[PDB]
Write a new protein. Structure first.
Lengths: 98, 132, 61, 84, 216
RNA sequence: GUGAAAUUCUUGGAUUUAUGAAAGACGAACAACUGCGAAAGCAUUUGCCAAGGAUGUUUUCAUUAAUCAAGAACGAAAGUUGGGGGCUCGAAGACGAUCAGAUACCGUCCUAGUCUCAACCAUAAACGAUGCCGACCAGGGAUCGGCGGAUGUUGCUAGGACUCCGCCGGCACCUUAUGAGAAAUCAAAGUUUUUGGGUUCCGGGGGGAGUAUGGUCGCAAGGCUGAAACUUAAAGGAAUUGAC
RNA sequence: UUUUUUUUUUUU
């Protein structure tokens, strides 16, 4: 039985899509199928922000940010709980969680 | 060197991997090493070399040693393993940075210098990845 | 060895819920808050003796 | 428009204009011929609205229109009148 | 034996193009036998933030490379050796749902400095735009790249290294590129992302001392 | 380096830091329910070389067309022969672990290979598991290319960017049944016992078996074509409840 | 993300 209309990927009007390597296990996975997340977080964790600011060597300074694009295979994405198994009706929802 | 409040800046190259932590301090050019304390020099078990506590101890030792060499402030160069491997810093990065901040050292510029390929050689593990 | 007062209790922590995570405010410095894991019953208004205040508590689970 | 709300033999002129030229009840082109005059020369030339060639006035040897993807673009000086 | 007890400290001096001359301090082992301290400091490269050189936090996204050219007394006289963006700045500029345009050109200055300049730009949405993307067509991208290359070559070839760095500091070339390319597509965050020195002229003390004041 | 370790490298200085050089791969982010191509496939710049769809056309020919045995062109990856390359990773192999064993999963080092040229090979879940051409058949919002119309801005040079309304063509999506279906589902898998638009291929319970034999292609690996004796009551599809 | 192999024949 077929469970997804898109077959678990995002390929339309296309023959082949080159793969990426899973950021967790290194497994090959088509890019249109890999679960991709973009993480933008402060280099200094919120706990240490005050201590680092108190030790600033300049009158003013804005702490940088860390940018990471994570590309997971299906297995790692499920195991890491990046995505979860949804009900038959709920897995047709494509909007990101609020 | 002239005034007590004058700031002498070094560069702290922090290599926080998932197996170890490095706290390497050099001059501005980077050609001269001041102190290099790793997390594996502060623990007994190989599994604790990258722990936050080992990073904190290494950072405390680094700050203590640098204070004797006339270094007041440090620039931060945080990196992960990079290459085709993980770009996420190890658990010891934040602990080392906090310990350096809390040890009386002034913090300068903070930069992420993880080596990022515009495109890389093949990553290890085969096309099926690490199977566990 | 510093003294901190519990301001609020975040909840139970650990596989068996053995420890409770709390937010404690240092008495000497009233503007510094830290995260600690506490063993044994604890409520708001309690004072703990921190043998070392450098560490930050993380969920044991 | 609902099918029973319109007459297939007497469609409103707006709908016929909006339809594709070949899908109208009777095929009819959207092109036309125009009388283009240069700015300074009294000579008058007929030009196709969708000319594929650079039409040049014989007298002054000036380009009147430039071929494009669809309708030809006239030179700024020249003006045109719909001929038909 | 302590190796730091036989090391002397030196002062790094920036060229005149920058407001601040004192960049920092570096040390080298004292001269012993054939090992000359002055040779250990020669051609050293220091990466310094433009915010420190200009004392302006708005320039903290630019990193400047200064190479040690000569040593006089306890001062190391440097000169411009390239510039780059910080990683966070570049990561912040690149975003989805927009087009990224890059160009490079190899140019020579009037001083015989052969350098490679790298330009970056992004398409900009209009204030009344309703569609969710601002994508330029490939032909438009090629036209923009042509304009970028032409402007960069014209700007670099008509000036020396000193005036080129003077142009870099306020980002005049990027402003010119944005003004010129607007007729093709609106652009934002137009910058000279990176400059690297390919070839440098034979060292001349006279030229070096023109950008460094008297230290005595 | 791992769950933890060990194999391994290390005061002949490992790892780490800065600068520089060489080599060979790979072209991140941008990058999408987006594009091009017959499919396979195709992502750094610039030039050259031919090719192409769609759009526009009050241009030309005038049935020249559709689909196709035989026969041809191309055809991922792996593999073959011989050069060139040989960074990375890495079949085989060798070690270190784990284990009752562990010819594995994990770790360490590596041959062929991975790249390119010349010549072969012709197979993939080569998938939309869904032939091509043509007609009709509900609605809606997005998006790519071209074109028509309207309108107001732009640190720009009539144009370009954006806004609105339309036509054609394309990749898709959402809703719905008056349709179909064993259903899952499908706006084509509809217009089918109220059965007929044209045309190619191709299945006939499950195994034996894609095997034997013959032929043919290939250096080989194998490809294409392709049985029978005998055996058997089910195998199998979709969906429901429970249990796990 | 350590390790976890197996349960005679028919029938209820
Ligand atoms: K399928
Ligand atoms: K997916
Ligand atoms: K370790
Ligand atoms: K090799
Ligand atoms: K091997
Ligand atoms: K076992
Ligand atoms: K083959
Ligand atoms: K498929
Ligand atoms: K459309
Ligand atoms: K029986
Ligand atoms: Mg299933
Ligand atoms: Mg394919
Ligand atoms: Mg170790
Ligand atoms: Mg698993
Ligand atoms: Mg296991
Ligand atoms: Mg356009
Ligand atoms: Mg290097
Ligand atoms: Mg594109
Ligand atoms: Mg790229
Ligand atoms: Mg060979
Ligand atoms: Mg290897
Ligand atoms: Mg090959
Ligand atoms: Mg086949
Ligand atoms: Mg359009
Ligand atoms: Mg049969
Ligand atoms: Mg058994
Ligand atoms: Zn994975």
């Amino acid at each position: 039985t077929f469970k997804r209309r898109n077959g678990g990927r995002n390929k339309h009007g296309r023959g082949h899509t080159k793969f990426i390597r899973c950021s967790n296990c290194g497994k090959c996975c088509p890019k249109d199928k890999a679960i991709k997340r973009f993480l933008v977080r402060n280099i200094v964790e919120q706990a240490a922000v005050r201590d680092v600011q108190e030790a600033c060597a300049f009158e003013t300074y804005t702490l940088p940010k860390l940018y990471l694009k994570m590309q997971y295979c299906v297995s790692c994405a499920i195991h890491s709980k990046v995505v979860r198994v949804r009900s038959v009706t709920d897995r047709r929802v494509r909007e990101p969680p609020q | 060197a002239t005034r007590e409040g004058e700031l002498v800046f070094g560069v702290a190259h922090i290599f926080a991997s998932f197996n170890d932590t490095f706290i390497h301090v050099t001059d501005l050019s980077g050609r001269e090493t001041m102190v290099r304390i790793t997390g594996g020099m502060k623990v007994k078990a190989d599994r604790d070399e990258s722990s936050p506590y080992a990073a904190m101890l290494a950072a405390q030792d680094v700050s203590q040693r640098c204070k004797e060499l006339g270094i007041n402030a440090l620039h931060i160069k945080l990196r992960a393993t990079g290459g085709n491997k993980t770009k996420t810093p190890g658990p010891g990065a934040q602990s080392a940075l906090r310990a350096l901040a809390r040890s009386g050292m002034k913090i300068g510029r903070i930069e992420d210098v993880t080596p990022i390929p515009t495109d890389s050689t093949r990553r290890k593990g085969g096309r099926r990845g690490r199977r566990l | 060895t510093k003294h901190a007062i519990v301001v609020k209790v975040m909840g139970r922590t650990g596989s068996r819920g053995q420890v409770t995570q709390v937010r404690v405010k240092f008495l000497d410095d009233q503007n510094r808050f830290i995260m600690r894991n506490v063993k044994g019953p604890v409520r708001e208004g309690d004072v703990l003796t921190l043998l070392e205040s450098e560490r930050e508590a993380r969920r044991l689970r | 428009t609902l099918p029973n709300d319109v007459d297939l033999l007497n469609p409103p002129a707006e709908l016929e204009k909006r339809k594709h030229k070949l899908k109208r009840l009777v095929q009819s082109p959207n092109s036309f011929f125009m009388d283009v005059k240069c700015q300074g020369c009294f000579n008058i030339t007929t030009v196709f609205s969708h000319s594929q060639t650079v039409v040049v006035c014989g007298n002054c040897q000036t380009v009147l229109c430039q071929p494009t993807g669809g309708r030809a673009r006239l030179t700024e000086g020249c003006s045109f009148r719909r001929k038909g | 034996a302590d190796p730091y007890a036989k090391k002397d400290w030196y002062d790094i001096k920036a060229p005149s193009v920058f407001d601040i001359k004192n960049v920092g301090k570096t040390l080298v082992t004292r001269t012993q036998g054939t090992k000359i301290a002055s040779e250990g400091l020669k051609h050293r490269v220091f990466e310094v933030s433009l915010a420190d050189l200009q004392k302006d936090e708005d320039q903290s996204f630019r990193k400047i490379r200064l190479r040690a050219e000569d040593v006089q007394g306890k001062n190391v006289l440097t000169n411009f050796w390239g510039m780059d963006f910080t990683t966070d700045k570049l990561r912040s500029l690149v975003k989805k749902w927009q087009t990224l345009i890059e160009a490079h050109v190899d140019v020579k200055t009037t001083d015989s400095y052969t350098l490679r300049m790298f330009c970056i730009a992004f398409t900009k949405k209009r204030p009344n735009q309703q569609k969710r993307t601002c994508y330029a067509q490939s032909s438009q991208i090629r036209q923009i790249r042509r304009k970028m290359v032409e402007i960069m070559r014209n700007q670099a070839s008509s000036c020396d290294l000193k005036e080129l760095v003077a142009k870099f500091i306020p980002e005049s070339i990027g402003r010119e590129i944005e003004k010129a390319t607007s007729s093709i597509f609106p652009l934002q965050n137009v910058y000279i992302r990176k400059v690297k020195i390919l070839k440098a002229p034979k060292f001349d003390i006279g030229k070096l001392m023109e950008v460094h004041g008297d230290y005595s």
